[PDB]
């Protein structure tokens, strides 16, 4: 089974958060499986939201029971959390908890509760120089500056380069905007021929930039 979350990365305060979990590789009509919602505040622990059984019986986190509805559609199930505040900013996971040990989690999706405006990121190349090269190994990267909200996804050469790649946790500037840098160490021999592109994606503002890093 595979589980896929979907929803907005940004939600206004007091609005209702609606998330759906698309199930693939099996139906939602045979126990004993507990189709779950779990959330995780950024860089922190886990909090259970609720379970739903194929019969339709639900169990909720008592601290969220008054605000939460989990429902099954006639092959999806959803989470609706009303009257959201900044305290509800977290990564939300949908999962399939099996009583016989076959548990699968979804990838998780980040929800930021804020009234602030959405801003697209600027993408600047961190060009490799002699001050970025040591022992035949050269460093280069991209600077993803002044955006809101999280997250931005950075890949190198359409997902090719994975080794040596370091995408740092975004920092919250004085701007109120997030700043991020993504770097990769490559052989110095390949700086003149092999192309290195900075693939930056930011859905909340529709920003897709492919940066030739020179």
């Amino acid at each position: 089974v595979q589980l896929q979350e979907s929803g907005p990365g940004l939600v206004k305060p007091s609005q209702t958060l609606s998330l759906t979990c698309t199930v693939s590789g099996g139906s939602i009509s045979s126990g004993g499986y507990y189709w779950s919602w779990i959330r995780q505040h950024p860089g922190k622990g886990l909090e259970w939201i609720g379970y739903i059984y194929y019969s339709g019986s639900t169990y909720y986190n008592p601290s969220l029971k008054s605000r939460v509805t989990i429902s099954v559609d006639t092959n999806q199930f959803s989470l609706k959390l009303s009257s959201v505040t900044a305290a509800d900013t977290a990564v939300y996971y949908c999962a399939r908890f099996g009583t016989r040990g076959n548990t699968h989690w979804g990838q998780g999706t980040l929800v930021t509760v804020s009234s602030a405006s959405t801003k697209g990121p600027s993408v600047f190349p961190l060009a490799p120089s002699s001050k970025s090269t040591s022992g035949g190994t050269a460093a280069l990267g991209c600077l993803v500056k002044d955006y809101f909200p999280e997250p931005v996804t950075v890949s190198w050469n359409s997902g090719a380069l994975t080794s040596g790649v370091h995408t740092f946790p975004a920092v919250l500037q004085s701007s109120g905007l997030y700043s991020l840098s993504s770097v990769v160490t490559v052989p110095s021999s390949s700086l003149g021929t092999q192309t290195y592109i900075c693939n930056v994606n930011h859905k909340p503002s529709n920003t897709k930039v492919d940066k030739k890093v020179e």
Binding site: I38, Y93, F124
Partner: protein, 215 residues
């Protein structure tokens, strides 16, 4: 917070570590404990269920135990890919499913000094009126590192932000990005920009500097 875990744990490669989980009669004492492994940047995964059962794809290096209101997860042959947050979980008879605060597992590899790299502000950023200078501390251990910015050989402060990655699943090292942000006017008034790096893997502080416009 309903279940109690130590915030951190550590062990050398090949050695064994145990992670405790303390609960009460209403959760651990009444039911069973599950364990979840969260690799950095990934969703949690089931590691242990029903106190000590392993799902498919989990090596026998991992084992769990439960006694009374306590539980314990053991990792026998520590690998670099074992670095993760480990959460115990249990059904509370009143609260439902509760978690522990989680335990970050650190692998004690050998001391590694960072490779230091510096990046002048790009010309496209300079068009915006801002100037960011990035200092890169790459693949080092332990985590503790100190960066000191120099501008025209003068020490800076309060004008930089730094960011650190999680421990790398393959070489057990950390990387650090330090970014100095100046106005374009500030940037052009000065001549030299330097990044001074202190780390126990270094016999003495390392400086990566550049004059404006070189290379």
């Amino acid at each position: 917070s309903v279940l109690t875990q130590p915030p951190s744990a550590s062990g050398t490669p090949g050695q064994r570590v145990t992670i405790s989980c303390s609960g009460s009669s209403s959760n651990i004492g009444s039911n069973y404990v599950d364990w979840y492994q969260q690799l950095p940047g990934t969703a949690p995964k089931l590691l242990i269920y029903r106190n000590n059962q392993r799902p498919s794809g989990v090596p026998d290096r991992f084992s769990g135990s439960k006694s009374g209101t306590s539980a314990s997860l053991a990792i026998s042959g520590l690998r670099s890919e074992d670095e993760a947050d480990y959460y115990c979980a249990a059904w509370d008879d009143s609260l439902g499913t509760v978690f522990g605060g989680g335990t970050k597992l650190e692998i004690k590899r050998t001391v590694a000094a960072p490779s230091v790299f510096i990046f002048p502000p790009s010309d496209e950023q300079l068009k915006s009126g801002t100037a960011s200078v990035v200092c890169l501390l790459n693949n080092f251990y332990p985590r503790e590192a100190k960066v000191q910015w120099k501008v025209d050989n003068a020490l800076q402060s309060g004008n930089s932000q730094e960011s650190v990655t999680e421990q790398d699943s393959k070489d057990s090292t950390y990387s650090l990005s330090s970014t100095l942000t100046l106005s374009k006017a500030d940037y052009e008034k000065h001549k030299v920009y330097a990044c001074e790096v202190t780390h126990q893997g270094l016999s003495s502080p390392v400086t990566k500097s550049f004059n404006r416009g070189e290379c």
